Design a protein around this ligand. Structure first.
Ligand SMILES: Nc1ncnc2c1ncn2[C@@H]1O[C@H](CSCC[C@H](N)C(=O)O)[C@@H](O)[C@H]1O
Ligand SMILES: Nc1ncnc2c1ncn2[C@@H]1O[C@H](CSCC[C@H](N)C(=O)O)[C@@H](O)[C@H]1O
Lengths: 376, 376
């Protein structure tokens, strides 16, 4: 079987982007699987293919190989390899083992929560290879969970479920993130792992960790701040926080359930002023249409946090959405510091950690933005 | 005396940008100096003012102070302070003491080359304060040179010259940059200091440091690469390189005078292939008009270096021009890796070191872009 694509799709794969959408496909196999892609009789790549989706082709190799399935399971080896050296030098931390496209393993995500792996396939061809994927994980895991309930799997013609693929997987587990530890529900945002560690270098009296979830940022901040106030919407989240709090021996970490948009503008009126504020909200946009409205949401919250800071305070602001490009994200923060009539010096601009790889030729692998500013 | 500005200029200073151009000024003192700025009878800031230039106002304080000259010399203290802690923990390295606008000291630049300071005033009001500036520098320098030959000083109505402002300043001096040392002509690009140190983590056979000047990158690379080949135009530059080379005890550092644009496309034909390439060209654009042509220049050289790399090699590419914004710079590198049909993974994205501060509300303080990619 061969996948044929037009001149547009051919150029995309030659520029090294991995996706070819349906409208640029001419002919393709009858069923989902691993097939080679051509532009006439010129080989372009090997790929994960689905004939029933707008995103039809997902390249994982740009050179012909004897066995397409071997080549794939090969990328998985080299992807697990790039980690290991770190997996044995900190077997208790939380790291990503496979970051889909970024590791040339499209539609596959596999996270490591200190021994207990969690696989996540979202491309049809993977579903049947879950047993091989698990085989490569045993030399490092104590178990493997298949969390395939993603609503995204429905577009692929895949069933929604969740269940073990090796050993026995607990209900939860603790992760050693630097000088602190946290729990995961076999919940954890490994993307901000190294940015949370960055925050340990700051000292001060009051710190306000907004959109904190389980208080990942608060635990690190509690080590250098008199008081820390983790804020969130889901009461279930703040709870995991208090739990992570005591588990570390931290008393200076009071939580506070509420809607950040009301809590902030309010704290500004009551005269509340902090030494460091961390903002780490969620997408605010599911589609290219939310970009406009999302921009305002992000702006408000940042404008507000800036006003809550004392002269000299630190602002750590972030975004994880693929709809909030980096130039936009930074434009917004400047729009916020502008309206606030406050001058922010740039402390540092960070992105995604090494275990969440980014491919230049494939923009969609780049979503995390993390910046640290000092108000003057 | 008071400086009056229209509604546009008033908004610029309220958004915390420091410049107000001539067309947004209503009334101002008869001669250059330090005056307060108002929008009607509403105080906006203190500033360095020149009535004969398009760039009329340069804010250095956004609050009224008893003594405008004291406030200025105060910013200078807090600017020298932010360094010192580092100046005593590495008294032999090269650091920037004053980065103009970024330190709220407009039109003033003062570099430290291991004890020997070099001041550079480009705003008229500073010229008469050079003696006070030098006073704040003695507690740290062995001398102070006034390199005021910048062609830019002519717009300000200032004379072009160069001469000592304290002690005796040598003809040259060595700087301790990490695990290597280099010479300066009382020549040195302190902006790339911390990016050169970053490069020490790489190992490999052949490394090609293009646009190297005195071989700052080559000296660091020689520590982990079999051979290193510093390239440049000015033969006088490569010479300082060989000198810096032997001074470190490095034999694996051959230089090569030539025009990078010819040398690269050529090396591609001769089949030359490297393990790491560093590109650190100059502006390529003096004005907003060169942006178009500059873009192509930057693109070519990057496209070429990418083709010279082996599968797995590292590319460290940079830009120091204020006309090549960051999104443009990264677009160009993607355009290059695209045309090259090579897939580049992002190793790291860095900017300017702490001693070359950037102000969010004032874009012109941000010019350095430094990125590291791994070809796959
Ligand atoms: N409108 C809203 N107001 C306040 N918090 C919200 C919100 N909408 C979502 N959130 C919370 O924002 C959080 C984003 S995830 C936070 C990640 C956390 N800092 C870590 O590093 O682990 C979620 O926990 C979510 O419950
Ligand atoms: N057309 C050209 N071809 C090759 N090199 C050039 C060039 N134009 C300018 N250069 C060289 O590019 C260099 C830019 S400065 C290099 C900085 C150096 N890497 C350091 O870290 O100290 C200068 O030394 C300049 O002489």
């Amino acid at each position: 079987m061969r996948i044929q694509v037009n001149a547009k799709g051919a150029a995309r794969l030659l520029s090294r982007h991995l996706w070819v959408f349906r409208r640029d496909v001419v002919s393709g196999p009858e069923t989902p699987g691993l097939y080679p892609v051509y532009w006439g009789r010129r080989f372009l790549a090997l790929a994960l293919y689905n004939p029933h989706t707008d995103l039809a082709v997902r390249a994982y190799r740009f050179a012909p190989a004897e066995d397409p399935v071997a080549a794939l399971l090969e990328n998985l080896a080299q992807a697990l390899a790039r980690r290991e050296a770190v997996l044995r030098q900190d077997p208790e931390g939380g790291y990503r083992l496979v970051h889909a496209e970024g590791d040339l393993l499209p539609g596959l995500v596999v996270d490591y929560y200190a021994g207990h792996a969690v696989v996540q396939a979202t491309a049809h061809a993977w579903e049947g290879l879950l047993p091989q994927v698990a085989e490569a994980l045993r030399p490092h895991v104590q178990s493997v969970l298949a969390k395939n309930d993603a609503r995204t799997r429905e577009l692929e013609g895949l069933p929604l479920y969740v269940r073990p693929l090796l050993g026995e997987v607990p209900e939860r587990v603790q992760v050693q993130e630097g000088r602190v530890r946290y729990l995961v529900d076999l919940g954890a945002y490994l993307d901000q792992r190294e940015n949370r560690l960055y925050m340990e270098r700051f000292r001060g009296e009051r710190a306000l960790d907004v959109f904190s979830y389980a208080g990942g940022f608060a635990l690190h901040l509690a080590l250098g701040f008199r008081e820390v106030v983790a804020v969130d919407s889901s009461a279930e989240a703040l709870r995991r926080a208090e739990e992570n709090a005591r588990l570390n021996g931290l008393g200076n970490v009071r939580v506070l359930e509420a809607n950040a948009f009301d809590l902030l503008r309010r704290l500004e009126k009551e005269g509340e002023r902090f030494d460091l504020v961390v903002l780490d909200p969620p997408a605010f946009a599911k589609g290219k249409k939310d970009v406009e409205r999302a921009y305002r949401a992000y702006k408000e919250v940042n404008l507000r946090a800036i006003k809550l800071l004392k002269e000299g305070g630190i602002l750590a602001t972030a975004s994880c959405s693929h709809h909030m490009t980096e130039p936009l994200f930074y434009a917004m923060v400047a729009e916020a510091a502008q309206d606030a009539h406050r001058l922010l010096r740039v402390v540092e601009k960070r992105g995604q950690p090494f275990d969440h790889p980014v491919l230049l030729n494939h923009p969609e692998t780049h979503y995390l933005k993390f910046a640290v500013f000092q108000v003057l």
